[PDB]
RNA sequence: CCGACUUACCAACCCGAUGCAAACUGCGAAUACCGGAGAAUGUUAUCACGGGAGACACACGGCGGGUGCUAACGUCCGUC
RNA sequence: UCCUCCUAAAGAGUAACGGAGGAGCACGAAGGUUGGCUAAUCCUGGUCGGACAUCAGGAGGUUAGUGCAAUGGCAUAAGCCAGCUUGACUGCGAGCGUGACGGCGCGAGCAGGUGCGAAAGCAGGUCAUAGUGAUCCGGUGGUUCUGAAUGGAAGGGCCAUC
RNA sequence: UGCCUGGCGGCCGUAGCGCGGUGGUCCCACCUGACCCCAUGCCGAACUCAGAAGUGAAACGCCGUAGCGCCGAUGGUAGUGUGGGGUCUCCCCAUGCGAGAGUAGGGAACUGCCAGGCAA
RNA sequence: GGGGCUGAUUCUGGAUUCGACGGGAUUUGCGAAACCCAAGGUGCAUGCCGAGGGGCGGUUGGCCUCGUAAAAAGCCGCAAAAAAUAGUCGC
């Protein structure tokens, strides 16, 4: 397994995220998806959840879950966030490496005019 | 060939559950981490647990492996 | 002779000897001497107790010891001021509560293992009687 | 990929018909081979690590890997953190030519060859096997080597017992004596 | 998988010499003859 | 106890230097750390001193 | 000599059962001590600052123990 | 003298020529950060190699490790490797803990100045608790702060330190 | 709305194991393809990208399962706050508090939100 | 009766009795002990029985032997078992 073991290198960045109280920027990578949510301090209330699976989002590209179709959405959900009028996120790992498509989902999400 | 032995250094419990504190006055002093930090709690450099800001201390237990929590509601 | 086998402690504390028997009843054998009175058996004691009690069957069956002494008790040599130090080890007592079951025999008939631990009880120091294998 | 395409389609049918596997998932695969020349002698000098990673260094792409030791043995005079072994961790595309090189041609290469053997698996169905020297391969030519060199060479496949282990090295021609 | 420390490799041509030829791809340099070849390896009789 | 002190001295303007201990035998070299001058209120680096 | 059979039993690790521990605890009291709320009662009984001291040889009785021989009007600590 | 367990009677504390052990150091990395990872020990198989190397697969579960003794804790690892650094920074410090006192401890946060990461964030030493001596005296560097009629000096003060 | 799945949590072993079944439309996982993004004390195992032909094998989810773990009274029992007593190294009585384990039983969860798919 | 020191030259860690003998394997060649497959040999055999055993009595609780009964093997005590098994010196 490598996601139930990627889970305890997230705790460390979600347990940080809740001990400082901060509403994080959670990521999830799938093969051919890619996914994005905005969760409130609370810790069981999702506030902003823009993602690829939305049958209205992913007909914008060929093939969903690359890196020109992760920043699809990622430019999207700030946009939704920001709709609600949210100036501090801080961007979460989720235990995936910040190099690929997380990396530009997070570039996109940069570009619609966020924060971190 | 006996006897040697320290001064005690009165580790243990300085504030109990419920009683309010002001920022930085130190809740348990202790060795391990036998109660770990949960809201408004900091642990020091030899784990001495102290109040970060104003309110009551609050003892709890939780965590997937039942760890003992400090936390301070702000009254 | 019983003494304990690779122990852990030189020298321990005296000691209270408080509450009842944490072993209840018959177990091993079919016949058992429980102990009454509230004490301590030497293991010089015992063994005297098991040298008699198994002298009536002289071979047969088998006898349950079901204690042990496992404390070091000590004694400071004579003539010797208090303190000084703790006194060295001389003899291993076991802490016997009311109600314990001493010694378990199995394969005699009732009547001689009767006198094979009233026998027995002449040995050791405390007062103590007979018991039946309890049933359930 | 040359023996892959033989067990693309002929091995996998051959293995259903075998073995009645539902899923095309369940036949096994080889995955990798342990090409590991555990010398150890070479405790006290580093030349007799460093020319056996020299004379291991024809089989995989590149330089010789080097490995440490586990812990610290009075007996076999070694201490925590030693660089005793050499080891291959062949797995994937690479290592499939590397068959026809070692269950083909240097099988009939073995001084007085009679066999190997059929019954010596790690419990799960994986092949573990070790030459007692390397002269059987072609890229040792006996000019500039100086050693007879062994090396445990383990085959893992993804085989459920030890009996498909086994069939999966039967259905590649294995020498069962 | 990684990079660089892998015993090294050569793709060579070679072709056992008793009629039978095992033509694949190699590491042992510039090229090799072999003697014997497994249709020829005494095992079948 | 082997570890005896020695002196980090900055090379900036200043004769202030950081002190503390090392181990000569062991390592022969000296020291390099750019620590933070109080003088100066900028990084400069320290080489040791006796 | 082979060399099989047998044996009180010497007899591991796993299973089940049986007891002991101040320096064993997966279990866990009484009371103890702290904080908050409240009411009755008490010549402020609470604490602070200043002037003045004496005292720092304790003793037995009770329980909690160390130690001793669970011996001592013994010794050493807790607490009344 | 200092540190750890017990005696100690579940707040802390608590003695005896009571029971047991450790310290008078080690580390510029065994520090800081980010990234990454998880052991003990078995049996299965495998060239020398067998009981012990190296390698593979499973059991197993932290019985491992944590500079060093015990205790407390630790995988969110405090264990382990890699990357880049020197936060092993200075001026403070609301706040408490603690001893008669001297003294010691914890501390977010503020100013300046740095490193890591993209980022919130972390760092003013090591997982914690021993690894140490008050003052005087004088040494060394920096500072006119003072410097006996004055210009300076000497000598002191201060700050760093021996 | 329901059935599912995925994501984030509350509680965190009645919540966990072992074993008996199921699922691939969707989703998820396996998967294929790897110069280049990037990865490496080694070989696209992990990490990374590009894709999605195959697959539900395995993982995972749910259903079954007490073969175990686990929760577990009631009464009795141990201890003890005081108050007295005894043949006072240990007990009794008055009242007050009340286990640990064991016993009948319970147990293979529940829970909050958000987005997709399918049925209404 | 107690305390200290000394306790195999290392007094703080890396034995290499240079050697037959004792343990382990390695390598070699193949042995019912390092073995099985009835097939290449190959027709009249094996076990239960009865039987007695090199000069003696026995002796594998089983062996050279006995086609229903008087002769034969390894070996036990028997016994061809050895003896200044280093010197040099005495009467």
């Known amino acids: 397994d490598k996601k139930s073991a990627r889970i305890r290198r997230a705790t460390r960045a979600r347990r940080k995220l809740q001990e400082l109280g901060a509403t994080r920027l959670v990521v999830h990578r799938t093969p051919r998806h890619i996914y994005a949510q905005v969760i409130a301090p609370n810790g069981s209330e999702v506030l902003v959840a823009a993602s690829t699976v939305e049958k209205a989002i992913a007909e914008q590209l060929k093939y969903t879950g690359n890196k020109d179709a992760a920043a699809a959405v990622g430019k999207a959900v700030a946009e939704r966030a920001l709709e609600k009028g949210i100036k501090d996120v801080s961007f979460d790992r989720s235990g995936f490496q910040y190099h690929g498509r997380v990396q530009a989902l997070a570039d996109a999400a940069r570009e619609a005019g966020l924060q971190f | ?75 | 002779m019983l003494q304990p086998k690779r122990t852990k402690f030189r020298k321990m504390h005296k000691g209270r000897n408080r509450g009842l028997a944490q072993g209840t009843d018959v177990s091993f054998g079919s016949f058992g001497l429980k102990a009454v009175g509230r004490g301590r058996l030497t293991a010089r004691q015992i063994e005297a107790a098991r040298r008699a009690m198994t002298r009536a069957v002289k071979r047969q069956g088998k006898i349950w010891i079901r204690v042990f002494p496992d404390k070091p008790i000590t004694e400071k040599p004579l003539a010797v001021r208090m303190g000084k130090g703790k006194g060295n080890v001389e003899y291993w007592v076991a802490l016997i509560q009311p109600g314990k079951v001493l010694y378990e025999m199995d394969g005699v008939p009732e009547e001689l293992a009767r006198e094979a631990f009233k026998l027995a009880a002449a040995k050791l120091p405390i007062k103590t009687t007979f018991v039946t294998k309890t049933v359930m | 990929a040359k023996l892959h395409d033989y067990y693309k389609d002929e091995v996998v049918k051959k293995l259903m018909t075998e073995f009645n596997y539902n899923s095309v998932m369940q036949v096994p695969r080889v995955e990798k081979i342990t090409l590991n020349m555990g010398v150890g002698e070479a405790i006290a000098d580093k030349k007799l690590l460093d020319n056996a990673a020299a004379d291991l260094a024809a089989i995989s792409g590149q330089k010789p890997l080097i490995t440490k030791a586990r812990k610290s043995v009075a007996g076999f005079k070694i201490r925590q953190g030693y660089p005793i072994g050499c080891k291959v961790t062949l797995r994937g595309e690479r290592m499939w030519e590397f068959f026809e090189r070692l269950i083909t041609i240097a099988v009939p290469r073995i001084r007085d060859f009679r066999g190997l053997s059929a019954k010596s698996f790690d419990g799960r169905g994986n092949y573990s096997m070790g030459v007692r020297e390397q002269i059987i391969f072609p890229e040792i030519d006996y000019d500039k080597v100086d050693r007879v060199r062994g090396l445990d060479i383990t085959i893992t496949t993804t085989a459920k017992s030890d009996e498909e282990g086994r069939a999966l090295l039967a259905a590649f021609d294995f020498p069962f004596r | 998988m990684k990079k660089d420390i892998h015993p090294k490799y050569e793709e060579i041509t070679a072709s056992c010499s008793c009629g039978n030829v095992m033509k694949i791809r190699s590491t042992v340099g510039h090229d090799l003859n072999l003697d014997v070849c497994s249709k020829c390896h005494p095992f079948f009789t | 106890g082997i570890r005896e002190k020695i002196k980090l001295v900055s090379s900036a303007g200043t004769g202030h230097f950081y002190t503390t201990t090392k181990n000569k035998r062991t390592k022969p070299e000296k020291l390099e750390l750019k620590k933070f001058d109080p003088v100066v209120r900028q990084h400069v680096i320290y080489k040791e001193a006796k």
């Open chain 2, 1 to 75: 060939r006996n006897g040697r032995d320290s001064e005690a250094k009165r580790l243990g419990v300085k504030r109990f559950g419920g009683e309010s504190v002001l920022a930085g006055s130190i809740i348990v002093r202790q060795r391990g981490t036998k109660f770990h930090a949960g809201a408004n709690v900091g642990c020091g450099r030899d784990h001495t647990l102290f109040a970060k800001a104003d309110g009551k201390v609050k003892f709890e237990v939780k965590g997937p492996k039942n760890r003992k929590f400090i936390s301070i509601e702000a009254e």
